[PDB]
């Protein structure tokens, strides 16, 4: 069977990453 | 009055989420006379509102450094308790 | 994954971190100043945070910027690979377009000067855009690791 | 027909899963049911095609799936039908195939 | 051959994806390269069959996976091979179904 | 040709194990 | 230095992760007395040995409810400061 040229239908589902939005603030003890 | 409020020091969250977290912490602290029981009530409120599982760190002395996700993070003081609660997932 | 945009963001993040070194040195000096104020009782009014409150907000912003820089450093190799592939493909397409326009400029009888000039300019723009895109992707990869 | 294959796949998904979520003990059973429904839809048409129906179900846990179906089939006689149907917590990228017999 | 097809699919998955750092813009390219390599290996085999290849590539993020294919052919002269391959934190599964013409 | 119902490769992936609940803890108290 | 003896009265976490976190906490306490730095080091060690993400908090007067994953919420106290490494997920 002489099959013709065929491509591939690409459908990549999306992932979700991790947000490294660190809230930096030094925490002191009671004074 | 036991006010678990905050100022603009480090508060990176949705406004409704931060207000709900502060109100839930204050209500749990008012309802429960023990710190662990107040933590349990606040965690129940968090798992009911922002779904399971969410935790809040609040106390006189504390410290937090983790992957604080956007619109669900906090590092401040809520009254005598240091409000450092960040939700990621 | 888009090499040009990723490299531009990486170079911008590198410049931002170079400035943020001095910005955070000033932020540390200001945290010390706010602490000394609170020692003199000059903690900031509770409308916003104190001097340490502005310091905590700046620390949150710096944590976000450091997270962006860490993501850039993690994905720099993939961004560079995507940019190199896109630049090579665009340059091959620009070569094909330049050759095709030079071979078959629109040289018909009426308005054929404008048509042939447009075909030649399209081929030249394709070649130059491919070269500029490849150079920009490489430069952004260099500026963003 | 690719449009008919996609419509049959969508109807089978609506009839079997529809708004059903993802369960570990039932994902494979749902995939088998969807593949069987697609195979029955392809066989009942009477077209002389060696129909192949593939069903893959993923969980919406931050995982993306790249779905594709390329086969050594004739361009003017055969083809493949790989689509994706999305749910709230059940990702399902399923493919139907057909080769001239 | 089922074992030969599984070995070729494993070699293609190793050559395409491997166990390097994950990338959404590169996972689809790896799946496409694996599909092209599997198609080339099937075409160079020379056996009288019309293979149907479905490559399922996922990332390990707690999502369940069930890559299955229900078809309509003859098991005496046609068959399919299944190979379980993956990465450090990603999956590389190809479903190849060789069908006699 | 002849065709009918048959079998296929049954592959399923079990998921990871984790437990989430609202468990209360407390730090020790000193003076 | 500091008596960084982690006595886990309640250890609902992995033994290997808890031991690695305890060793890292002892090293960090030998290095410095910053409880925030010790908690950050414990969280970083837990997240490195058990993937992202892990959060650890060290304090004195605090009450928190751990909303974490199974076999990853280690509450080990080096004395009285309960360093609860509740890896949320």
Numbering used by the authors:
A (entry chain h), F (entry chain g): 110 to 140
B (entry chain d), G (entry chain i): 1 to 89
C (entry chain e): 1161 to 1305
D (entry chain v), E (entry chain k): 13 to 113
Give verbatim excerpts from the published study on this entry.
Cytoplasmic dynein-1 is a conserved, minus-end-directed microtubule motor critical for cell division and long-range intracellular transport in eukaryotic cells. Dynein, a member of the AAA + (ATPase associated with various cellular activities) family, forms a 1.4 MDa dimer composed of two copies each of heavy (HC), intermediate (IC), light intermediate (LIC), and three (TCTEX, LC8, and ROBL) light chains (LC), with the IC, LIC, and LC known as accessory chains. Cellular and structural studies have shown that dynein primarily exists in a pseudo-twofold symmetric, autoinhibited Phi state incompatible with movement along microtubules. LIS1 plays essential roles in the activation of dynein, including relieving autoinhibition and helping assemble the fully active DDA transport complexes.
